[PDB]
Amino acid sequence: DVQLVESGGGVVQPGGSLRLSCVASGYVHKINFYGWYRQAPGKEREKVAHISIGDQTDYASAKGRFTISRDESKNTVYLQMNSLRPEDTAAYYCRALSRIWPYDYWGQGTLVTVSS
Numbered sequence: 001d002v003q004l005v006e007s008g009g010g011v012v013q014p015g016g017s018l019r020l021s022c023v024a025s026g027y028v029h030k031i032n033f034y035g036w037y038r039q040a041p042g043k044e045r046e047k048v049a050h051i052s053i054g055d056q057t058d059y060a061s062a063k064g065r066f067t068i069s070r071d072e073s074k075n076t077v078y079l080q081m082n083s084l085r086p087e088d089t090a091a092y093y094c095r096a097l098s099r100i101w102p103y104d105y106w107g108q109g110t111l112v113t114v115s116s
Contacts, residue, residue, distance in 0.1 A: 019081070036066070094106070
């Protein structure tokens with residue numbers, strides 16, 4: 001079911017920022033990977049950024065502009081998005097991969113719209 005609840009999306013002007021949240025319920029466990037992805041209508045899903053549980057961080061112009069982070073005490077993963085451009089308009093999805101069944105959890109999505 002939807003175990004990762006997202007929020008933070010909205011409409012912003014080019015050059016603006018957004019901070020997306022992805023809150024994990026008490027049912028998600030043994031996660032070794034958190035990731036952010038996006039999918040614009042008519043296009044394929046693209047990888048945005050990820051965290052691998054062992055203390056590592058990577059961002060696939062997501063290289064710099066989109067930063068992933070986590071608050072362990074709140075069970076939440078974040079995506080800080082800076083210098084937004086119209087081409088960044090997409091539904092953004094968070095994901096958690098577990099070593100045990102059901103193995104993969106996806107958020108419901110949040111819409112990011114860059115429009116001047």
